């Protein structure tokens, strides 16, 4: 076909959730685990584990073997969400709001260890598990560096485009990068193939972020990110050519200036560039239904 | 004893594997305690346990650094929770750098530990098991810290609940310190459980003694920390005048400390702490006699002597 991508995401997400329920059961101490399972139970697009399972399939493997890696990465993601929410302080209600900050910190730390425990249950050669552990951990370190950078940007008045893109790469790209590349690691695929899936993830993630930030201008309210002063690629290119907007303390006038300077279309062109780059990296992989799903998925990430 | 030797090795590997890096903000925070220089107890237990198994304990160094990294991770997040302004002789991480950076710093140490563990020179099969066991250990420390903090607001907790909390909060990380060389080098379940049980019991006793060292001042009771002493005494219905206050008079706290010695409760702690360290030794017997094996013995002793 070529138009079922929302249905494949759905199908694989449904698998992800079924195994989430199997592997991340609520336990004692009940207060820790209710915080620990909160975000997971409120749902999630499950985009990263879905990518893992599509990548696994596109590599000619039984993608059920990739479930653990898939859920570990979704577990890492959920963990970052809990801790991140502690630091934006701003639904559903955040975990630190419902359970307090200590329970929230320990809830993230719990999910964090479980991620690795789950990944280690993978049905794959130990040498590859050890490499997947090493690689996921390095990604975790990078996400913290990305989160740190992103917060630094809140205190800065002059964030460069490349700095910002570097931030997004760690904050959003690398986790998506390893959800595409981890079945390569687990199943002994070689370096050029892992590299192709990694780049696919990173470039999808970066573009996915740019488009996400475009949706703030193209439930929640128009121009939210503007009044909250968030540095997006759009904002950064407008500043880059001295547009300087009359909100940033929490409007429709500002939004016109962003289109008028082409900063909105710069960001679109940047996000599409990233997704084309992500798709060209897939060329290394054998054509298959699953490879085309990954291709259409990159498209979806920026066309929704 | 001969620990400053391995303590020396561990800090050399720490400075080799846990470099500062960019963003310097994040790593200045993440290396703050490591540079402050803890006693490195658990790493030394890992190197000695390895040599007691008659292995090349240098091969166990990555697991030694990894467990110390976990330990430092917990310190950072714990200090956020207790809102301590200082830990031993240095300001806490959240106070110098802020709560969000403190969170990210421990989150970074946390991942760094699994990356270091995975570098081990051992059968990969056994690195996987080591990652699985250390990650469950980390889940339990979190379960413990949540238990310990839940205790604060409870009116009374039994010795059992409290001792299950100490087993998770500070014991299992000490158990896996000794356990992990048995895991890494394919010793069998008897040996693992033996080094495991030694590490846990050493932990609990080590904890009970660390609560005694505050009676050895005063802060545990003003802070309301529920120790094994105050659980015995309160089980003995000992009216304790200054347990909640935080601010207190010297005479008021002295009469509360005075009570506690005379309760038949400070004795209980030393005694109960001692029957744990002994349970560690009598467990450690499954391992062959060795300079290393007796070193773990004398070391389980040092946890009760301070």
UniProtKB/Swiss-Prot annotation, chain B:
Note on how the cofactor is bound: Binds 2 Mg(2+) ions per subunit.
Record EC number: 2.5.1.-, 2.5.1.1, 2.5.1.29, 2.5.1.10
- One MF term in the entry's GO annotations: metal ion binding
- List the catalytic activities from the record: isopentenyl diphosphate + dimethylallyl diphosphate = (2E)-geranyl diphosphate + diphosphate; isopentenyl diphosphate + (2E)-geranyl diphosphate = (2E,6E)-farnesyl diphosphate + diphosphate; isopentenyl diphosphate + (2E,6E)-farnesyl diphosphate = (2E,6E,10E)-geranylgeranyl diphosphate + diphosphate
What keywords would UniProt list here? Isoprene biosynthesis, Magnesium, Metal-binding, Transferase
Query: What positions does the entry give for Mg(2+) 2 binding?
Result: 78, 82
Subunit architecture: Homodimer.
Listed name of the protein: Geranylgeranyl pyrophosphate synthase
Say which species the protein is native to.
Geoglobus acetivorans
Species classification:
Archaea, Methanobacteriati, Methanobacteriota, Archaeoglobi, Archaeoglobales
